[PDB]
Amino acid sequence: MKAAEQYQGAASAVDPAHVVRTNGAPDMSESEFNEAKQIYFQRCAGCHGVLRKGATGKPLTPDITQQRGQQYLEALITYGTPLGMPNWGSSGELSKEQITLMAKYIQHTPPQPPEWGMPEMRESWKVLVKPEDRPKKQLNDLDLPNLFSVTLRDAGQIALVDGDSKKIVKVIDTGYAVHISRMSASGRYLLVIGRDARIDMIDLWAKEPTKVAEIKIGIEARSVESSKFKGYEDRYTIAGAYWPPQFAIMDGETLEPKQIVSTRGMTVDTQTYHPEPRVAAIIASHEHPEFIVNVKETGKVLLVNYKDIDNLTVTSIGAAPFLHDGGWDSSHRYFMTAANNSNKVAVIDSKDRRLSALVDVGKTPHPGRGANFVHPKYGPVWSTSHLGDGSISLIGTDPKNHPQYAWKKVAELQGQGGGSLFIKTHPKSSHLYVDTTFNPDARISQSVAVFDLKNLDAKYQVLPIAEWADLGEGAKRVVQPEYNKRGDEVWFSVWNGKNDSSALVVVDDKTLKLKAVVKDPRLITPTGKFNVYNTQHDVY
Amino acid sequence: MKAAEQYQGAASAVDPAHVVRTNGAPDMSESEFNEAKQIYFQRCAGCHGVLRKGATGKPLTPDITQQRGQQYLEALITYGTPLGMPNWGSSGELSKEQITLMAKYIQHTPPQPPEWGMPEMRESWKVLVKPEDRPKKQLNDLDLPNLFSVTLRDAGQIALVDGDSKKIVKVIDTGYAVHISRMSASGRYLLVIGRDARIDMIDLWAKEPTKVAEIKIGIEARSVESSKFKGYEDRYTIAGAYWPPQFAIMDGETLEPKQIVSTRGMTVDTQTYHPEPRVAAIIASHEHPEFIVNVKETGKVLLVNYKDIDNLTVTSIGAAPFLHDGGWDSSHRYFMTAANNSNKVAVIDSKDRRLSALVDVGKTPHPGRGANFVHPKYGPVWSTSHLGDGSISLIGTDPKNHPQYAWKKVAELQGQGGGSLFIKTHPKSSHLYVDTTFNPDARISQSVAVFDLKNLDAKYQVLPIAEWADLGEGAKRVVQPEYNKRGDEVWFSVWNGKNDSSALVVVDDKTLKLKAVVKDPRLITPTGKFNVYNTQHDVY
Ligand code: DHE
Ligand code: DHE
Ligand code: HEC
Ligand code: HEC
Ligand SMILES: [Cl-]
Ligand SMILES: [Cl-]
Ligand SMILES: [Cl-]
Ligand SMILES: [Cl-]
Ligand SMILES: [Cl-]
After folding, report:
1. Residue range(s) defining the domain that contains residue A312
2. Among A39, A63, B224, B251, which lies 20 to 30 A Cα-Cα from A46?
3. Is the domain of A146 the same as that of A70?
């Protein structure tokens, strides 16, 4: 009756005088609030995050913002900061009236976007073609290993480009602005994820590659990955979300949602609670049946063991805050990940399940998956490009046979300048390609630098990738070099405007000569290109 | 710098129109809000939680509460429901004007108490006596294994009573309303955790037992535990918190804070995010170097492996919502814990790291640690009483030599009625005791039922514990039977008010006749009683 009521009726130990109401912000209309909120996610949420704690420095919470004041915040938004906070008034990007509204907005409690659990996922889950009715053999005659999965960012779709043919073979509708493409261990299924957290599974064996499953694992995402460990091929596919701060494990044949795990938790450096730790790069392990999951704001690398997904076991490894992209080393044991805004590179030992070291590097490293090669003096190494730096950092990745040079910034190369984004090579190649996508100089932003590994002390050659495309108007930012299955050509993307004309430019790695140019009215804002074989077997 | 700012300056994939502002509640003054907020934690937070999502039914969040309306909520609060929601108007416990305020308060966004990270812990952390300054031998002449640690709830302290002398040997100030007492594997250090989350470690080898370390792991807590795996004795001490939803691991010798882990995460039944999953019972594994941690609202049981404390591995086991108290079986392998308000008992396999079964029992089981004995027909069993009915459930715990009765509610026993909290026995005892602390009948609450393991079909005997104390005015509620080391005597608390007289009653287990009554002006609101040896070695 009420005996259990009296049992739990005791007063909470929490002192009510220490629980506080959240107000004290300047009055804002409903129309005004929504206008600043539209600006925040259009211009600010990328760094500061949904809850405004995703960047360095003091956060944009009420207690902090109200302490500064209306005019401090207006002043700091108008003129920015030399530590990565741009200026929105001096640049003319925002208006005096708008900046005033932003200063008022961040003094209010940050509005919350909704959660996304199993009910939301299962409703988003669609098996368009059931595995029973899927082909048992490759129907088409495509040379799938040398297929490129090219992202048509603004078009909300992806294009399959036959490597040798240089022609588009199909265009598939996907989530908006796909970020990466990943292959299943079998090589039959192509996985793509949009920044809106929609995943699509493509069957490369159908008469024409078709989608077979679909699911939305959140509101904002970046990464997807498939199980690579011996015996667990196509068993499970993982995907991490920016919001909600979580990742999800799904069946690898149907994408059925199985498990959802929150990444909300304590940070490695300060060991305080963080309400929005965004999941970034995910990579499958060869040593154990685990997914190595990067968690950005908390600086944790998680080892998600799918041996038993009903009773999940996770090992949380401390590294450095702001974990971002990364990739394997030549051995496929040591996961080199870039804690970009910590200017460090963490080394995750997938075998011993620990952090091998933290390597100091240049200003904001950005390697993507990186580039591995054998240095004459320093043995095997792993290299990264940089955004705030024009440098290239080489890191020893050979502890067994090169303890002298291991997890050390053994040597630097210098590229065309800052704004670099991806560094690329190939085992069969003697060159090292470095793009300058976000360099503020036009010429540099549409060129790439090529180093000669045969003689590494020489200066690089500059290749005019955009010039070779002969597009015309547009910024024509070049981005992301990728090799073919055979390794003797290097594909480039000219990330021109949505309403301008773009292209993919293919270079002969043997001669460093223009080999071909890919143009098509369907190839809108081409960004990421992913060779099936090279991506599937971590060739980089 | 602009390079990195353009790279991370892309608009968020989050639609601002789907990120909504949280204020549509009826206006309240600051004086009125703080009065309703005070009643909430004084009367309601125990069940509904800090964020109003800890009870069954629909939560008291703005979206739901505003939908009902002011008149609906006033009525429901005024009258209640027959499903665990007490009456507050018919009761006459809250005035008509307070209920109106409470109805408005729960329509506002719930106020939030602060977090409690490593900085807050370290400043709260005190080492009163260094390990170097502690004795290498037991200075005092006390029979430590037979000492009782008695909680003096309202006095904010505990008393150490000598089992055979029946006298109080010292009184030690602690956190407010200590909840449990635990002993180190070495049996030298007594650990007590306050209702307010303050932990005190007591050295029983000093000339007089003195506090040697102190730490606050949160704002509200209930549970504390020590590592009991071979080779890891006294190496780590763990404690769980109600708020913030987290647990923490400290050094066993100094209580230095080492790690903090957030229990915020997804539930087991709906697989949705819960922002306040408060930690409940915690027990130390013998099969592996792990802590078994109960997480209430999410219904998860976490196996926290301390093999490597810097890289913490945690297996998450699903069970049923509202996990609470629990205990070992006779084997010390299967953790029998009760999801109270799910009316089930979960069996967690300490060895295989999985859920062996979910057993349906009575309304709101409350076992504490439980009571193990050998049923003449059904083999080794684990028993529990309930709050919602006078039932006593027996559950087989022998899968090796009694597989047909394993994890089955093999039989039921009837006590005096509902409102029971603790059932007890001893390996050297022929009797089985059940209390009725929260029974609404005065005499029932003052008595305890006693069963005969030699003849289970016989009706219980009733011993009037409070009557035997001869205390006078007061509710004189009796609670928590506890044996001594030799199992000769059974101790009971008479949990009277702080301005009334209380006592500890001791009964001769071999004869069931009163053996002693402990009265003392320092014995204020005695609740928990913890024999050092029986608590240390999990004898129940
Ligand atoms: C987590 C993450 C990965 C690795 C996932 C993995 O390995 O599993 C990744 C890699 C990538 C890769 C993989 C290339 C590779 O070599 O693997 C590409 C092409 C890429 C195109 C872009 N990224 Fe990416 N990217 C983010 C996050 C990520 N970028 C951002 O947070 C940021 C700064 C904001 C955003 O706009 O998403 C960001 C900006 C960009 C771009 O502006 C690019 C150039 C175009 C776009 O669509 O946004 N990111
Ligand atoms: C999590 C938890 C444990 C086990 C910890 C472990 O094993 O590591 C426990 C066990 C206990 C034990 C251990 C006895 C045993 O045999 O193990 C005792 C004496 C006890 C005295 C009370 N408990 Fe307890 N108790 C709660 C939580 C807990 N009770 C509540 O949430 C609730 C309902 C609210 C509250 O007031 O704290 C609650 C009410 C009570 C009481 O009213 C008692 C009788 C007096 C008091 O201090 O509030 N609880
Ligand atoms: C990165 C791509 C950013 C974008 C886009 C915006 N901000 Fe930012 N901000 C950023 C960093 C790395 C820092 C801290 C660096 C430092 O030491 O200054 C900041 C700082 C602010 C602050 C100051 C908070 C404080 O320290 O007291 C405010 C008030 C702020 N930022 C607001 C803001 C607004 C309104 C933006 C767009 C409308 C915005 N920022 C964009 C990184 C980035
Ligand atoms: C247990 C010890 C409780 C205490 C003390 C309080 N409440 Fe409660 N409440 C409880 C349960 C188990 C339920 C659900 C039962 C059901 O019939 O659904 C509730 C329900 C409410 C509701 C209704 C929510 C809804 O579905 O709309 C309200 C508005 C509510 N409770 C408020 C409330 C207040 C204001 C209290 C003290 C001041 C309070 N409750 C105490 C459990 C317990
Ligand atoms: Cl579609
Ligand atoms: Cl955590
Ligand atoms: Cl393993
Ligand atoms: Cl979780
Ligand atoms: Cl082990």
Report:
1. 114-540
2. A63
3. no
